[PDB]
Amino acid sequence: LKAFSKHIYNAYLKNFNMTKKKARSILTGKASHTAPFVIHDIETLWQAEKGLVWKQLVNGLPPYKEISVHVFYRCQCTTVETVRELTEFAKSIPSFSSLFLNDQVTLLKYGVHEAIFAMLASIVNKDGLLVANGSGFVTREFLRSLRKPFSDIIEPKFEFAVKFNALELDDSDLALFIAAIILCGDRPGLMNVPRVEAIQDTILRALEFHLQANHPDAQQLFPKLLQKMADLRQLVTEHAQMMQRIKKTETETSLHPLLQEIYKD
Numbered sequence: 001l002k003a004f005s006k007h008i009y010n011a012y013l014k015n016f017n018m019t020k021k022k023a024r025s026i027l028t029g030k031a032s033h034t035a036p037f038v039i040h041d042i043e044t045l046w047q048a049e050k051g052l053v054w055k056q057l058v059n060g061l062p063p064y065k066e067i068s069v070h071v072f073y074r075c076q077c078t079t080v081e082t083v084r085e086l087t088e089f090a091k092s093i094p095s096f097s098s099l100f101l102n103d104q105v106t107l108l109k110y111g112v113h114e115a116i117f118a119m120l121a122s123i124v125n126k127d128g129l130l131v132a133n134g135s136g137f138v139t140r141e142f143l144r145s146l147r148k149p150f151s152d153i154i155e156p157k158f159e160f161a162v163k164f165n166a167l168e169l170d171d172s173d174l175a176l177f178i179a180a181i182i183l184c185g186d187r188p189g190l191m192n193v194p195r196v197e198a199i200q201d202t203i204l205r206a207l208e209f210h211l212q213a214n215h216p217d218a219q220q221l222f223p224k225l226l227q228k229m230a231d232l233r234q235l236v237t238e239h240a241q242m243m244q245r246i247k248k249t250e251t252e253t254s255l256h257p258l259l260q261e262i263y264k265d
Contacts, residue, residue: 002213005176005206011092012175015085017133019171020122026134027125036130036137042067045142052135064252068147072246075154076256078131082116083108083258090182095199103191109262110187113239114232115178121161122174129158149250153242160235164228167221173214176207181229188265 013019025033037052039045045067049058057073059065065073087108090096096104123130128139143154169177185197208222215221240263246253 001202001206001209004202005172005210008093008179008203008206009172009175011089012171012178015089015092016119017085018123018130020169020174021171023123023130023134026130027137035135037135038128038137038139039131040139040142045071048132048136052132054132066147068150069250069253071143071146072150072253074131076259079113079116080256080258082119083112086112086115086178086182089178093179095202096183099192099195103196106187106189106191107182107184107196111182111184112262113236114181114229117157117160117232117235117239118164118178118181118228119174120157121164124158124161124165126162149242149246153239153246156235156238160231167218167224167228168215169225170214173207173210176203176210177225177229179203180207181232 022033025031026036037044037048039048048054054074056077058070061067061070090104090108096107099107120129123134126140128137128143130136131138140155140158144151180200180203183196183200183203185193185200187196190196207225211218211221211225243259243263247255
């Protein structure tokens with residue numbers, strides 16, 4: 001069961017560009033590494049959009065862009081990229097790839113944002129989060145200063161993150177936690193529910209034993225992670241409701257087609 005756990009952890013190490021270990025060494029928890037440029041206002045954002053590069057979007061901010069919309073587009077680039085990694089992470093686990101492709105799409109459709117938000121914590125601290133593969137740090141206050149639609153879709157994520165990082169989980173813990181969120185036999189339209197439930201239960205029993213070893217002193221941690229999965233469920237529900245309002249009221253902001261395929265139902 002722990003051999004199954006190491007296989008999930010390696011799938012994680014091979015498919016994710018940023019790990020909590022590496023993220024923690026950047027904002028300096030103890031083992032400092034290197035640099036992060038701070039974007040805390042329009043001037044520094046402009047400087048980042050030149051200095052730490054990025055190249056791909058970065059279009060004007062008057063006729064149909066503006067500081068707040070440009071930041072939202074950046075959020076989209078980031079979420080679509082993490083979706084690609086999550087997909088390769090899932091495909092790297094045998095049981096997941098054995099399922100018929102339609103079931104794989106259904107699982108990813110309803111669980112990728114729950115995983116994204118769980119992972120967001122790894123690169124978040126009370127004051128901000130890293131961007132551009134760790135090369136930058138965007139302050140929490142700056143994000144809050146954005147127009148009222150875009151400035152409040154990210155704030156609740158910080159509140160989750162802070163409370164989530166208090167559990168002090170490591171990458172090996174996260175590998176299993178994310179796998180558990182993706183292999184959820186409770187998703188709408190799942191064709192083979194029994195098979196999925198079976199894979200999930202197995203992931204959850206390996207997670208439980210893994211904590212037993214990894215966190216021998218933490219009490220009620222496993223059931224606590226279970227409540228978090230439930231909280232993540234509600235966080236995504238609120239997130240989608242907010243994405244709904246932006247689509248209805250923010251006529252100039254474009255929406256990535258892939259992210260459009262996820263929320264549609």
